[PDB]
Amino acid sequence: TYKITVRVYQTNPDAFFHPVEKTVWKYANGGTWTITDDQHVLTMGGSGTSGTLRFHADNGESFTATFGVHNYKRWCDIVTNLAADETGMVINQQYYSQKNREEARERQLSNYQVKNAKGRNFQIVYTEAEGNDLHANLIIG
Amino acid sequence: TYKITVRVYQTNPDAFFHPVEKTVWKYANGGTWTITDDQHVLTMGGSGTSGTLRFHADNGESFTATFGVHNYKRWCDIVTNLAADETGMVINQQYYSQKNREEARERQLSNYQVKNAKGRNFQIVYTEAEGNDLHANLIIG
Ligand SMILES: CC(=O)N[C@@H]1[C@@H](O)[C@H](O)[C@@H](CO)O[C@@H]1O
Ligand SMILES: CC(=O)N[C@@H]1[C@@H](O)[C@H](O)[C@@H](CO)O[C@@H]1O
């Protein structure tokens, strides 16, 4: 089993994001998104799968944060500027079919940040980046 | 916009189900799964999409409950006895690719029930079953 426990930090009162979708990819016997003490917990059956959280703000901004384990190490990626047909389940699957997404996954990043077209920054940092009980902060700018 | 507000009723203390995944299909400008007063709310950009909730009990049982709108009329379906590679996002997409699932959607049911292999009943009943503001009970036996 691998577990990724995500704490969401919102740093910027000019918006408020909330989770609108939580998906689990089918490899490695799948897994679950649960909630413990306000943290999003992705539990997976082994290495090689992942799960996507999609967040939406009132003003129409949105992003996906995806977390998983590739070759026994954590990975993460953020996709923003989402098209109206890019739901979380679309994004999640693309990590196993679309080359640019596959490559992002295979980099096994413990830390990644990117901005949307409005200039808002989004960041994932694993504070526990080793072993089977992984912990990450999702930091919204 | 179409909205489907879902109330979950668990009636049998021999199990406890909890939501482990919530997906939104890409058609009709997608949508969101939000929470209001312990109710799961699927808000969709128009007719022709859906979203899936997957529930797991710690005794191993699981199922998906899918809710959507097809040619302006609500639909629903439940899939039980899930394989370990049948996550909610796999199931949700099957309503637009796998014949038996497409047919279930096309039925435009205001209510649907099915039992799993252990004999547990699962039912969806739309108590507000017309118009753009739809309300459904998900009743676990
Ligand atoms: C602005 C934006 O969302 N860029 C994303 C990038 O962060 C991500 O690594 C990628 C591959 O999945 O596709 C996009 O380039
Ligand atoms: C036991 C069980 O899950 N049966 C289902 C049924 O509920 C359903 O509507 C369908 C089409 O999606 O697939 C399966 O036949």
Author numbering:
A (entry chain B), B (entry chain A): 1 to 141
Q: What does the report in the manuscript say about this coordinate set?
A:
Sclerotium rolfsii lectin (SRL) is a cell wall-associated developmental–stage specific lectin secreted from the soil–born pathogenic fungus. SRL displays a clear specificity for TF and its substituted glycan structures. In the current study we report two recombinant variants SSR1 and SSR2, generated by the deliberate changes of the amino acids incorporated at particular sites of SRL by the synthetic gene construct method based on the complete amino acid sequence of SRL. Interestingly, SSR1 and SSR2 the two different variants of SRL, differ in their glycan specificity.
In both the SSR1-GlcNAc and the SSR2-GlcNAc complexes, determined at 1.9 Å and 1.7 Å respectively, GlcNAc was found bound only in the secondary carbohydrate binding site of SRL in agreement with the complex of GlcNAc with SRL. In the SSR1-GlcNAc structure an MPD molecule was found bound in the primary carbohydrate binding site similarly to the SRL-GlcNAc complex structure. All atoms of the ligand are well defined in both variant complexes, within the electron density map which has shown that GlcNAc binds to this site with two alternative conformations with respect to the hydroxyl group O1, α and β that have equal occupancies. The rms displacement values for all atoms upon superposition of the SSR1-GlcNAc and the SSR2-GlcNAc structures onto the SRL-GlcNAc structure are 0.5 Å and 0.4 Å, respectively. The structural mode of binding of GlcNAc does not differ significantly in the variants and the SRL structure. Briefly, GlcNAc is involved in hydrogen bond interactions with residues Asp77, Ile78, Thr80, Arg101, and Tyr112. All hydroxyl groups of GlcNAc except hydroxyl group O1, are involved in hydrogen bond interactions with protein residues, a fact that offers an explanation for the alternative conformations of this group. In both alternative conformations, the hydroxyl group O1, in the ligand complexes, is involved in hydrogen bond interactions only with water molecules. The glycan array analysis of the variants demonstrated that SSR1 recognizes TF antigen and its derivatives with high affinity like SRL but showed the highest affinity towards the sialylated Tn antigen, unlike SRL.
